[PDB]
């Protein structure tokens, strides 16, 4: 089932497995409140500005939350994508 990270006018849709999507979403709910508001062409320094960058921030966020078997799965997902 497809998963979609969203921020502003750019999104990164990736295919997570079926029996992970419940607790894959729990990391994204903690992720969207860590990002600032989209501002005038994404020129804020802490704000991501590419789908490779917005999914790049999410792969850094999920390593701070003690919840494995998603980090290395999204790591191999980052390399194949």
- Interaction site with a copy of itself (CB under 8 A): 1-2, 4, 18, 21-23, 26, 29-30
For the bound state, the minimum distance from the C-beta of residue 15 to a copy of itself, rounded and expressed in Å, comes to: 11
DSSP code per residue over 10-67: EEEEEE--GGGHHHHHHHHHHHTTSS----TTT--SSS--SHHHHHHHHHHHTTTSS-
CB 73 within 8 A of CB 20: yes
| Closest to a copy of itself by CB, 43 or 69 | 69
For the bound state, the minimum distance from the C-beta of residue 2 to a copy of itself, rounded and expressed in Å, comes to: 7
For the bound state, the minimum distance from the C-beta of residue 71 to a copy of itself, rounded and expressed in Å, comes to: 17
């Amino acid at each position: 089932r497809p998963f979609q990270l969203t921020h502003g006018s750019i999104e990164h849709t990736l295919l997570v497995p079926n029996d992970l999507f419940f607790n894959y979403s729990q990391l994204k709910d903690e992720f969207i409140k860590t990002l600032p508001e989209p501002t005038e062409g994404f020129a804020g320094d802490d704000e991501p500005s590419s789908p490779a960058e917005l999914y790049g921030k999410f792969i850094g966020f999920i390593s701070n939350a003690q919840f494995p078997q998603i980090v290395e799965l999204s790591l191999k997902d980052f390399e194949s994508r």
